[PDB]
Structure formats: C-alpha cells, structure tokens
Amino acid sequence: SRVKKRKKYQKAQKKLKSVRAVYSGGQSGVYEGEKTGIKKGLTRSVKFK
Amino acid sequence: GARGGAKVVIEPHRHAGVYIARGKEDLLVTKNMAPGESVYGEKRISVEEPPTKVEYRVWNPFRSKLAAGIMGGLDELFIAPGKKVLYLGAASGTSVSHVSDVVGPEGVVYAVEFSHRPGRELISMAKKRPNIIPIIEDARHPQKYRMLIGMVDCVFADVAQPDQARIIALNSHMFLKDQGGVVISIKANCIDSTVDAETVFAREVQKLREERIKPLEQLTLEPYERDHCIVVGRYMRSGLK
Amino acid sequence: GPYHIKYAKNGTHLLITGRKGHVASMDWRKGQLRAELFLNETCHSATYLQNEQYFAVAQKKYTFIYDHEGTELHRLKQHIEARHLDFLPYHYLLVTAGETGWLKYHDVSTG
Amino acid sequence: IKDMFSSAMEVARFEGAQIKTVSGIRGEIKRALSKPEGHYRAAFEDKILMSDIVILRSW
Amino acid sequence: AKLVHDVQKKQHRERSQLTSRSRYGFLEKHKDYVKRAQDFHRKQSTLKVLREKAKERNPDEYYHAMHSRKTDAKGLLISSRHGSLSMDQVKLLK
Amino acid sequence: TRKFGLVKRTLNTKKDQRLKKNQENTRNIPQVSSALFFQYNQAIKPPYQVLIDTNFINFSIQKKVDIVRGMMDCLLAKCNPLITDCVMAELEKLGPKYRIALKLARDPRIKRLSCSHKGTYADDCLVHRVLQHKCYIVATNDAGLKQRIRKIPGIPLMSVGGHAYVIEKLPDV
Amino acid sequence: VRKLKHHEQKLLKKVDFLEWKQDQGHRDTQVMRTYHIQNREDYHKYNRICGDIRRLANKLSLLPPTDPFRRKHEQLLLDKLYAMGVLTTKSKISDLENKVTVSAICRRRLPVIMHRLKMAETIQDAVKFIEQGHVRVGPNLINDPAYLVTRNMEDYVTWVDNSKIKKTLLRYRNQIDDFDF
Amino acid sequence: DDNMRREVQRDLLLIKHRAALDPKRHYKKQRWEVPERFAIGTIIESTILETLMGDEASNKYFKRKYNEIQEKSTSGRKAHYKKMKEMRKKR
Amino acid sequence: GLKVPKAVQKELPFKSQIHQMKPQKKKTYMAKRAVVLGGDEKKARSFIQKVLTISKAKDSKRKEQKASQRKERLKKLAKMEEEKSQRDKEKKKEYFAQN
Ligand SMILES: [Zn+2]
Known part of the structure; x- marks a missing residue:
C-alpha cells in the first residue's frame, strides 16, 4: 500500500504542473529565456467584477 | 540558451514599449534608453537600423516583479510610453531602468527610495537616464517631496512594508490623476506571516476599495515568485460603484 | 417647367420643383447643389x-x-394628391391640402 | 471459380449453395462451366479479387 | 469487464495467404474489403452528381468570365500552367 | 451616357449607419488558485473567516444557535464571522417582523465587510468574493446558493441543520 | 441629428426622423432591393393584388368547412396561383394567407427567372440585358423587366438569335456556327 | 523592405516551425503569423539557420527522422503497386 | 484518384468545370534561364524541406491523437448523459406523485 500511494502522489505532482504553474525554487544559473515561448495575446489574471 | 552569437527576431508585445525576442527561446526585452551599457548585468541585443546601432535590454522575470506580471499575462498596464509614473520602493535600477525604458524620452519616472546605500546607485543610474528623478525620501510622508512631484498617470508600489496600504493611499491622493493607474506588488510574508497568503490578498484588496481604488485584476507570480501577487486597479475618485 | 420655388426659413437654401418632376435643393449663395431628383x-x-x-x-x-x-x-x-405643402416650424407639423378637400397635419418628429 | 470441384457433375449437386470469401463477400453457385471440368460460375454481392479465397461451408 | 475471465478475452490470431497463392498478394480480410467498398462508393457518388450536373446544364447560361476562359478542340477547358513577353522584356532578360 | 438598371435612391435599413440598430455594430483564461491542490484547499487554516448569509441568521435564531459559539462548536476553532452590506441591507428590508434578526446581526463580535457595487443582491456578492479569494467559508441554507458554491472548488460550505451547524467541504474536521 | 444625451432621450423617446410606423419597417424598400425593382409603386400594386387574394381566402374560410362552394373555389385559387408560379405548392389552403406575399410575385419577374436559370450572374445584370434587347420570350423580344413569367412560359425564355451574348456562349465552347447567325 | 532576404525569410520560417527542431523542447501551442514590423538582432555579452546545420547531432536527427517519414509516405503507393503486378508475372 | 469521363467533363456547367492542367513538353525559355544556387544554398535548401517535413508530420500525428481521444470521450459523455436523463425522469414521476 505504501508504494502505491508513493507512486500515486508523485503522479499527481506531475499533473498539477500541467494544471497550473508551480514554484520550483526560482532561477538556477544564467537566465536562459522563456523556454516554452511567450504568448502575446493570452492573459491569465483573475478579473474582479 | 541565449548565448552570445545567437541571432533573434525582435517583435512588439501587446503592451506598448515592450518587445519580444524570438528564437529557440523567447525573451522579454525593452529598448535601451542609454545604449552600450547594462544596469545590472542583463544581456543586451543590438539591431542595425538604417545605419544607427540601436540596442535592447533583457528583462529578467526572476529579478523584476513587474516583468513576472508580463509573463503571467496581465491584461492592462498603465505604464506606457509618454506617461509619468511614480515608482515607490525603487531599491535600484533593476526594475526602474526597465520602466524608464518603457515610458521613453517623453515620460518621466519618479523613483522614491528610503535607504541611502541603495539610493546612491539610484542617483548614479539616474544620470544615464535623464527621465528618472530620484527622490531619496520616505514614502510614508509624501508631504516631504510634494514640491518634487507633479501629477502622475500611474503609481507603481513595490514597497515591502506591513502598512503599504496606507503608503499607497497617501501617495495616490496627492499625485495620482483621476481614473489613473495603480499597480501593487503584494508579498504576503511581509504584511502578515501569521495568516495564509489568500487571506492577506483579500485584506489588501479590501483596503484599496476603502481608499477609492477599484481593483481591476489580480495575478500571482508563480513560478517566478512564491506567495506574491500583483493587483492592478484604477483610481476612481468619483465612485467605485 | 414651370418651376415652384421655396426658400428656407433662414434664406440660406433654395428648393425648386419643376412640374415635370425636376427637384433641386441648393445653397444658392455658394452655388452648391445639395440634391437633384429627376422624378419622372x-x-x-x-x-x-x-x-x-x-x-x-x-x-x-x-x-x-x-x-x-x-x-x-x-x-x-x-x-x-396634396397640391400645397406648409411646415409650422415651432410645432414640427407638415400641412397638406389638395383635390380631396382634406386638411392633414403630420408630425415629422414622431411621424 | 476453380479447384472447388473435380467434375461438372459435382457442381450440379451444389448449384444455389451459399458461398463466401475470406473477406466476407457472400455469393452463390450459379452454374457449372462446360470447360474445364469442375469450374463454375458464381455471383457475389460485390466484386472480388484474385487474392481472395472462396469457401463453401458444409457439415 | 464483469463476470468475464481473461481467458475468454483471448486474442484470436489472423491467418495468412497460402504459399501456392503468394504471387497474387495479400489475403484481404473484412477490414481490407471495407476500405475498397467505401472508396468505390465515394467515387461513384461524385460521378453520379457530375453526370447529373451535365444533364441539367442550361445551354443559355452566361458568365462574364467566358471571355477569359478558353476551351480545347476536344471540348475540354484549357487551364494555363501558371496564372507572352514583350520584345523589350525579352531584350532585358537576354 | 445614362447608366442601365437605374433605381431610385432609398434608405437601406440594413446598412445605414444612422439607424440605431446599425449604430451599435486578448483572450482571458483565469489562473487556477495556487491555494488549491486539485479539490483540496491547502491554504485555508484557522482562524477561519465565514461569510454569513441572510437566511443563516434566521435559521440560527429558530434553532437557538449562537452565531459565534455555534461556529466554534462546529469547527473547533476561532471563527471570524463577516456580514457584508448586502446581507445587512437584506435584513433591513425584511421589515419589522425580523427586527430580532437585525439586532443579533449587529452584535459587535460580528465584523462588517464593505461593498462597492450598486446591487443589493447578496447571493451574487458572496459568489464573486469566493471566486476571487479562496479564504472564506460560506454560511448559508439557501438551496440555490449552496449548489453554486459546491461547483466552485475549495470553498467550504457551512449550514445550520438539526440542532447545530454543519460544515461540508473542510477536511480538517 | 446628433446623439441625444441622457436627459434628452428620456424627453424625446418617440423621436425618429428615419423610421416611422407608417413605413411598415421599410418592407417595400427591402423587397425592391432584393429583386431590383425600379418603379417605386410596383411593390404597392403587387401588395394590393396580394390583399385581394387574402381577402377572398378569409371570406372562404368563414364558409362552413363541408361547403362544396368553399372547396371548389379554394382549389381554383390554388390552381391558378400555382400555375402563375406565385405558389410553390398546392397541398395546403393556409398557404393562401401565410405564403401569398409580394416577394412571391416579384420572384416571377423576368430578371429573377433569368437569374435562376443562370442566364445572368445577378438580377441587376439580368435587368441590363433585358433593357439592352438581348432577351426574348417565345418569338417576342421583351425589354420590360417587370414581365411576369408563368411556369409554362419559363420554357421559352431565351436569348435573341443575333445576340452578342449568344455568340460568346458558343465561341467559349467552340460551337459557333456562322451559318445560323 | 519588400526584398525579403532569403536568409531572413528562412529564419522566420525556422521560428514558425521551431517545435520540430529538437525532440525535447515542446513549446506552447501558438501560431506566430509573421509580424508586420520586426528587427533581427544579435546578443551582446552565424545566422540561426547556419548555426543549426553546423551541429551534427541535429543533422543526424533530421536525416533519420526525415527518412522514416519517407518510408511511411511511400508505403502502398505506386512503387508498391508495381511490385504486386510484377509478382503475378512469372519472373 | 477519381477520373471523370471526358464526355461527362465536356458537357459540364460553367460553374463546375474541372481544371486539368496538361504537362509541359517543350522547354520554356524561362525554364532554360532560371539559375539555381548550388553548393551552400543547396544544403540550406535541403535542410528547410527536411524541417518542414518533420513539422507537418508531427502536427498530423498529434492532431490524430485528439481525434482518437475525442471519440473515446464522447462515448464516456453519452453514458453520463443517459444516466442524467433516466434519473431525471424518475424524479419527475416522484414529484408529480405528490401532486
Ligand atoms: Zn455586496
């Protein structure tokens, strides 16, 4: 049981990254740019009504 | 990644005064007000324009919280070319210099700092940038520098203080134009480490509403920062309803 | 022809209507033609x-x-079959009379 | 079709029998061909190919 | 899968063309036949439409483009590969 | 040269800009709150902040359940109850019949939240607040409002049932 | 007029200089546009004919349902209108009320039928060819674009023999025979 | 300028299709129509097309990957059809 | 591919006439004139059509993945809809049983 719950949690950690951005320690080394690209026309802010 | 001899394509962002450098990786870049030098060691890009050698600077999201806001997808920034911006908590030119680039020659930047040791470099940086006015004064007492500042289109506050809501309150009333912009960077730990971050953000927004500032949007700065959010609002003196 | 002429209340524009159906609206002082209809x-x-x-x-x-x-x-x-047309300026009424022997008032604002 | 039967007499016994291909196309034994012995004519619901194999199910 | 053994859900393997018939090619199965029948019906469907369009054509239809387009002696429409050079243009190119 | 197919010039209702119907004529995907681990709100922790709905006060009085003490009993933690202007306005509009409910709602231990919107409809005000910030418990017995809050992930939902309050989506219990 | 301010609009709710109730929504202008009608009063002459049909159908409907007179006359009206082409179908009597419209009559004018027969790319183009004497119905040349074509007479709409359009059709397919022309 | 240098044209064409350049990057799904205004520049501290073909790991990857796509594209095509008709002939 | 008979193709209406371009045989002067940059440009011109081949294939495979999962998902969605449909009927019989 312990091993199955171990693999279940680490699987959920991977899925959480695809659901939202997660802090992962910040910058490591020289800044190498946005690796997956910048989207000019997309906004993710939560807008107050 | 973004090595020396690499070649990139520079295109404009949705926000005026901000650009994107395409390639194997994308970079947020702003046109260099003072070509040929770096404020804090950021990478720079030169373009041969008919010829004059124009230069661009890289904006690192992990160093500037405003840059992190652009990456996360803020909808509206009141910081734009030809506008006066009152920058509170300007520790040094890490983020003010990039703001000075956006406003351009026609705009001005009123950089307010309290500590003298960061202040000294802010003076030295300001002399490369004619459009930056350094004000080495405490932001908790705007009356001290009322002579120095006129009306400003936007107010940007990065002060990491428990009473930043009052600091933003007083400065906006004196200098911010009606229907002007307000941009706040809130770090939960400085304000109240006892409670969770969500409680702190809800509390700061309520204070801004009390101060006739209508919040427009909120964004958290992950993965660049933890327990941070940028709140973008408008100063509606007439009424928020 | 023949031509029936009506000037504007302020005298700036001239309206001429020919019997065979030539209607022209013009600023006679500046010699500019606003409209010209050749209703047959x-x-x-x-x-x-x-x-x-x-x-x-x-x-x-x-x-x-x-x-x-x-x-x-x-x-x-x-x-x-209206043969006469008049406009009351302060009341916004158009008045017509003709062979039917009927006087009709029409509100241009509301129609 | 060829090789199903050895003489035209055998075909006559099975005229009208249901046949099908490996593809599943259904057909019928219509008539025996006079030349050569054992060959016969069939009609299928759709055109068949040379690589197909026709099978008659019997018990 | 309720009340079914995995033995019941066993794969049944697919048989192949006889060696004596290996020259003719691959032994088609039902899935292969479906590909033929569907393709044939798709083509026959359009052809029936095209034959009908031909039958109901009005000889008196006029389009302004009839000036630009040209027809071959066979009666088929001629389409230019890319869509002459003046002597001045040729002289420069030469 | 006179053109062919001449027609009288007339008003084109579809295309004329003057007519009112013709005068009138960046994507946003909200981020998922970092306080949520899938359906589990990790951020929320005591002391809790609870938004009181109008019907909650009325049912609490019917069952003789004190708001502050009843919440502490349900969650076993310090609760900071909050009443918005909409809820306070709704209580005042109920009339003289609910004067008792109005006086309990004004207890000093119940803190007040201001509102900066025109409407007096409280159901919408509460739903907008929870969508913005995942730091509130919603205390309500309205069937319509409860179903809205259930669809929103990471919003604990409190109700008065039987003899005391009940909290649904709060794993720390 | 300029856009009215708030207090003005409240006091001038019914003011409209371009749309009146007596216009009936500018239905006449819309229909004249769709079928390129050049005489301003052609719509209202059609409208009076439609009203006559609708008046008769209403009077017939008020006769008892099993009346032989009612059934006979309604069928005759359905027969005549379908033959003219105004009505697409003969099955239902309610079509005399619901489906009898000016648009139905305008849809039988010579330019529109030329368009549906693909003799012209647009109704405006068909009107020009009629006005330029390219079109004949039967052996008779017609330059009136208001000519109403019955179902039977739609078979005899064709080009004039020496028309330049006819030569272009035959030249395009390489089927021009100069003996005919 | 409308001249649109072949180098400049290829680099923009190599940014539109940057997802295929490396099987380990997997960028965000965007379209990136060519902008009306742009400026190519270099980084201060060899065009990208020339830079990329200079590497050997990438060149060996494209040749392999390209060849595999050719095998898929020419399977069951006219080349296969002629073989089938040729077996039916005796030799 | 489908081959329309020429008899049908001949008597087709102007709107629907198939454009079939014939092959070129006589060598055109422009075809004899065009210069193709060889050597370095050949390698930079094979490289591009290799890259665009990978990109077109990667898109056509990921796009087929969505269409495979689209079919699976709508089958799952339909089952949930049927449950919500039948159970909804039961509630409306229990409600009107009171009424
Ligand atoms: Zn409210």
Missing part, C-alpha cells in the same frame, strides 16, 4: 422641414420626405 412624375410643390436637411415633395398622388442628399426617407401614404 408630376410634382406640384415642395417645402423644407425644420432645416435644409429634410424636404417634402408633393408628387402625382403621394407626398415623399427626402434627405439632405436626396435619399427618399418616407412615402406618406395618408396624404393623397
């Missing part, structure tokens, strides 16, 4: 409404309201 029809009289922008023409059987440029806006089906 018998036209009796025309009038300006509250200003030079709109004018009315009494054609063979119906009265039509036209625009500043000459685009037809309405066909007044209720006004039948």
Whole structure:
C-alpha cells in the first residue's frame, strides 16, 4: 500500500504542473529565456467584477 | 540558451514599449534608453537600423516583479510610453531602468527610495537616464517631496512594508490623476506571516476599495515568485460603484 | 417647367420643383447643389422641414420626405394628391391640402 | 471459380449453395462451366479479387 | 469487464495467404474489403452528381468570365500552367 | 451616357449607419488558485473567516444557535464571522417582523465587510468574493446558493441543520 | 441629428426622423432591393393584388368547412396561383394567407427567372440585358423587366438569335456556327 | 523592405516551425503569423539557420527522422503497386 | 484518384468545370534561364524541406491523437448523459406523485 500511494502522489505532482504553474525554487544559473515561448495575446489574471 | 552569437527576431508585445525576442527561446526585452551599457548585468541585443546601432535590454522575470506580471499575462498596464509614473520602493535600477525604458524620452519616472546605500546607485543610474528623478525620501510622508512631484498617470508600489496600504493611499491622493493607474506588488510574508497568503490578498484588496481604488485584476507570480501577487486597479475618485 | 420655388426659413437654401418632376435643393449663395431628383412624375410643390436637411415633395398622388442628399426617407401614404405643402416650424407639423378637400397635419418628429 | 470441384457433375449437386470469401463477400453457385471440368460460375454481392479465397461451408 | 475471465478475452490470431497463392498478394480480410467498398462508393457518388450536373446544364447560361476562359478542340477547358513577353522584356532578360 | 438598371435612391435599413440598430455594430483564461491542490484547499487554516448569509441568521435564531459559539462548536476553532452590506441591507428590508434578526446581526463580535457595487443582491456578492479569494467559508441554507458554491472548488460550505451547524467541504474536521 | 444625451432621450423617446410606423419597417424598400425593382409603386400594386387574394381566402374560410362552394373555389385559387408560379405548392389552403406575399410575385419577374436559370450572374445584370434587347420570350423580344413569367412560359425564355451574348456562349465552347447567325 | 532576404525569410520560417527542431523542447501551442514590423538582432555579452546545420547531432536527427517519414509516405503507393503486378508475372 | 469521363467533363456547367492542367513538353525559355544556387544554398535548401517535413508530420500525428481521444470521450459523455436523463425522469414521476 505504501508504494502505491508513493507512486500515486508523485503522479499527481506531475499533473498539477500541467494544471497550473508551480514554484520550483526560482532561477538556477544564467537566465536562459522563456523556454516554452511567450504568448502575446493570452492573459491569465483573475478579473474582479 | 541565449548565448552570445545567437541571432533573434525582435517583435512588439501587446503592451506598448515592450518587445519580444524570438528564437529557440523567447525573451522579454525593452529598448535601451542609454545604449552600450547594462544596469545590472542583463544581456543586451543590438539591431542595425538604417545605419544607427540601436540596442535592447533583457528583462529578467526572476529579478523584476513587474516583468513576472508580463509573463503571467496581465491584461492592462498603465505604464506606457509618454506617461509619468511614480515608482515607490525603487531599491535600484533593476526594475526602474526597465520602466524608464518603457515610458521613453517623453515620460518621466519618479523613483522614491528610503535607504541611502541603495539610493546612491539610484542617483548614479539616474544620470544615464535623464527621465528618472530620484527622490531619496520616505514614502510614508509624501508631504516631504510634494514640491518634487507633479501629477502622475500611474503609481507603481513595490514597497515591502506591513502598512503599504496606507503608503499607497497617501501617495495616490496627492499625485495620482483621476481614473489613473495603480499597480501593487503584494508579498504576503511581509504584511502578515501569521495568516495564509489568500487571506492577506483579500485584506489588501479590501483596503484599496476603502481608499477609492477599484481593483481591476489580480495575478500571482508563480513560478517566478512564491506567495506574491500583483493587483492592478484604477483610481476612481468619483465612485467605485 | 414651370418651376415652384421655396426658400428656407433662414434664406440660406433654395428648393425648386419643376412640374415635370425636376427637384433641386441648393445653397444658392455658394452655388452648391445639395440634391437633384429627376422624378419622372408630376410634382406640384415642395417645402423644407425644420432645416435644409429634410424636404417634402408633393408628387402625382403621394407626398415623399427626402434627405439632405436626396435619399427618399418616407412615402406618406395618408396624404393623397396634396397640391400645397406648409411646415409650422415651432410645432414640427407638415400641412397638406389638395383635390380631396382634406386638411392633414403630420408630425415629422414622431411621424 | 476453380479447384472447388473435380467434375461438372459435382457442381450440379451444389448449384444455389451459399458461398463466401475470406473477406466476407457472400455469393452463390450459379452454374457449372462446360470447360474445364469442375469450374463454375458464381455471383457475389460485390466484386472480388484474385487474392481472395472462396469457401463453401458444409457439415 | 464483469463476470468475464481473461481467458475468454483471448486474442484470436489472423491467418495468412497460402504459399501456392503468394504471387497474387495479400489475403484481404473484412477490414481490407471495407476500405475498397467505401472508396468505390465515394467515387461513384461524385460521378453520379457530375453526370447529373451535365444533364441539367442550361445551354443559355452566361458568365462574364467566358471571355477569359478558353476551351480545347476536344471540348475540354484549357487551364494555363501558371496564372507572352514583350520584345523589350525579352531584350532585358537576354 | 445614362447608366442601365437605374433605381431610385432609398434608405437601406440594413446598412445605414444612422439607424440605431446599425449604430451599435486578448483572450482571458483565469489562473487556477495556487491555494488549491486539485479539490483540496491547502491554504485555508484557522482562524477561519465565514461569510454569513441572510437566511443563516434566521435559521440560527429558530434553532437557538449562537452565531459565534455555534461556529466554534462546529469547527473547533476561532471563527471570524463577516456580514457584508448586502446581507445587512437584506435584513433591513425584511421589515419589522425580523427586527430580532437585525439586532443579533449587529452584535459587535460580528465584523462588517464593505461593498462597492450598486446591487443589493447578496447571493451574487458572496459568489464573486469566493471566486476571487479562496479564504472564506460560506454560511448559508439557501438551496440555490449552496449548489453554486459546491461547483466552485475549495470553498467550504457551512449550514445550520438539526440542532447545530454543519460544515461540508473542510477536511480538517 | 446628433446623439441625444441622457436627459434628452428620456424627453424625446418617440423621436425618429428615419423610421416611422407608417413605413411598415421599410418592407417595400427591402423587397425592391432584393429583386431590383425600379418603379417605386410596383411593390404597392403587387401588395394590393396580394390583399385581394387574402381577402377572398378569409371570406372562404368563414364558409362552413363541408361547403362544396368553399372547396371548389379554394382549389381554383390554388390552381391558378400555382400555375402563375406565385405558389410553390398546392397541398395546403393556409398557404393562401401565410405564403401569398409580394416577394412571391416579384420572384416571377423576368430578371429573377433569368437569374435562376443562370442566364445572368445577378438580377441587376439580368435587368441590363433585358433593357439592352438581348432577351426574348417565345418569338417576342421583351425589354420590360417587370414581365411576369408563368411556369409554362419559363420554357421559352431565351436569348435573341443575333445576340452578342449568344455568340460568346458558343465561341467559349467552340460551337459557333456562322451559318445560323 | 519588400526584398525579403532569403536568409531572413528562412529564419522566420525556422521560428514558425521551431517545435520540430529538437525532440525535447515542446513549446506552447501558438501560431506566430509573421509580424508586420520586426528587427533581427544579435546578443551582446552565424545566422540561426547556419548555426543549426553546423551541429551534427541535429543533422543526424533530421536525416533519420526525415527518412522514416519517407518510408511511411511511400508505403502502398505506386512503387508498391508495381511490385504486386510484377509478382503475378512469372519472373 | 477519381477520373471523370471526358464526355461527362465536356458537357459540364460553367460553374463546375474541372481544371486539368496538361504537362509541359517543350522547354520554356524561362525554364532554360532560371539559375539555381548550388553548393551552400543547396544544403540550406535541403535542410528547410527536411524541417518542414518533420513539422507537418508531427502536427498530423498529434492532431490524430485528439481525434482518437475525442471519440473515446464522447462515448464516456453519452453514458453520463443517459444516466442524467433516466434519473431525471424518475424524479419527475416522484414529484408529480405528490401532486
Ligand atoms: Zn455586496
């Protein structure tokens, strides 16, 4: 049981990254740019009504 | 990644005064007000324009919280070319210099700092940038520098203080134009480490509403920062309803 | 011809309606033509409404309201064989009379 | 079709029998061909190919 | 899968063309036949439409483009590969 | 040269800009709150902040359940109850019949939240607040409002049932 | 007129200089546009004919349902209108009320039928060819674009023999025979 | 300028299709129509097309990957059809 | 591919006439004139059509993945809809049983 719950949690950690951005320690080394690209026309802010 | 001899394509962002450098990786870049030098060691890009050698600077999201806001997808920034911006908590030119680039020659930047040791470099940086006015004064007492500042289109506050809501309150009333912009960077730990971050953000927004500032949007700065959010609002003196 | 002429209340514009159906609205002082209609029809009289922008023409059987440029806006089906047209400026009423022996008042603002 | 039967007499016994291909196309034994012995004519619901194999199910 | 053994859900393998018939090619199965029948019906469907369009054609139809387009002696429409050079243009190119 | 197919110039209702119907005529995907681990709100922790709905006060009085003490009993933690202007306005509009409910709602231990919107409809005000910030418990017995809050992930939902309050989506219990 | 401010619009709710109730929504202008009608009063002459049909159908409907007179006359009206082409179908009597419209009559004018027969790319183009004497119905040339074509007479709409359009059709397919022309 | 240098044209064409350049990057799904205004520049501290073909790991990857796509594209095509008709002939 | 008979193709209406371009045989002068940059440009011109081949294939495979999962998902969605449909009927019989 312990091993199955171990693999279940680490699987959920991977899925959480695809659901939202997660802090992962910040910058490591020289800044190498946005690796997956910048989207000019997309906004993710939560807008107050 | 973004090595020396690499070649990139520079295109404009949705926000005026901000650009994107395409390639194997994308970079947020702003046109260099003072070509040929770096404020804090950021990478720079030169373009041969008919010829004059124009230069661009890289904006690192992990160093500037405003840059992190652009990456996360803020909808509206009141910081734009030809506008006066009152920058509170300007520790040094890490983020003010990039703001000075956006406003351009026609705009001005009123950089307010309290500590003298960061202040000294802010003076030295300001002399490369004619459009930056350094004000080495405490932001908790705007009356001290009322002579120095006129009306400003936007107010940007990065002060990491428990009473930043009052600091933003007083400065906006004196200098911010009606229907002007307000941009706040809130770090939960400085304000109240006892409670969770969500409680702190809800509390700061309520204070801004009390101060006739209508919040427009909120964004958290992950993965660049933890327990941070940028709140973008408008100063509606007439009424928020 | 023959030509029936009506000036605007302020005297800046001239409206001429030929009997065989040539209607022209112009600023006679500047010699500029606002509209010119060649309605192949018998036209009796025309009038300006509250200003030079709109004018009315009494054609063979119906009265039509036209625009500043000459685009037809309405066909007044209720006004039948009107031979005289008048406009009361302060009341915004168009008045017609003709062979039917009927006097009709029409509100241009509300229609 | 060829090789199903050895003489035209055998075909006559099975005229009208249901046949099908490996593809599943259904057909019928219509008539025996006079030349050569054992060959016969069939009609299928759709065109068959040379690589197909026709099978008659019997018990 | 309720009340079914995995033995029941066993794969049944697919048989192949006989060696004596290996020259003719691959032994088609039902899935292969479906590909033929569907393709044939798709083509026959359009052809029936095209034959009908031909039958109901009005000889008096006129289009302004009839001036630009040209037809071959066979009666088929001619389409230019890319869509002459003046002597001045040729002289420069030469 | 006179053109062919001449027609009288007339008003084109579909295309004329002057007519009112013709005068009138960046994507946003909200981020998922970092306080949520899938359906589990990790951020929320005591002391809790609870938004009181109008019907909650009325049912609490019917069952003789004190708001502050009843919440502490349900969650076993310090609760900071909050009443918005909409809820306070709704209580005042109920009339003289609910004067008792109005006086309890004004207890000093119940803190007040201001509102900066025109409407007096409280159901919408509460739903907008929870969508913005995942730091509130919603205390309500309205069937319509409860179903809205259930669809929103990471919003604990409190109700008065039987003899005391009940909290649904709060794993720390 | 300029856009009215708030207090003005409240006091001038019914003011409309371009749309009146007596216009009936500018239905006449819309229909004249769709079928390119050049005489301003052609719509209202059609409208009076439609009203006559609708008046008769209403009077017939008020006769008792099993009346032989009612059934006979309604069928005759359905027969005549379908033959003219005004009505697409003969099955239902309610079509005499619901489906009898000016648009139905305008849809039988010579330019529109030329368009549906693909003799012209647009109704405006068909009107020009009629006005330029390219079109004949039967052996008779017609330059009136208001000519109403019945179902039977739609078979005899064709080009004039020496028309330049006819030569272009035959030249395009390389089927021009100069003996005919 | 409308001249649109072949180098400049290829680099923009190599940014539009940057997802295929490396099987380990997997960028965000965007379209990136060519902008009206742009400026190519270099980084201060060899065009990208020339830079990329200079590497050997990438060149060996494209040749392999390209060849595999050719095998898929020419399977069952006219080349296969002629073989089938040729077996039916005796030799 | 489908081959329309020429007899049908001949008597087709102007709107629907198939454009079939014939092959070129006589060598055109422009075809004899065009210069193709060889050597370095050949390698930079094979490289591009290799890259665009990978990109077109990667898109056509990921796009087929969505269409495979689209079919699976709508089958799952339909089952949930049927449950919500039948159970909804039961509630409306229990409600009107009171009424
Ligand atoms: Zn409220």
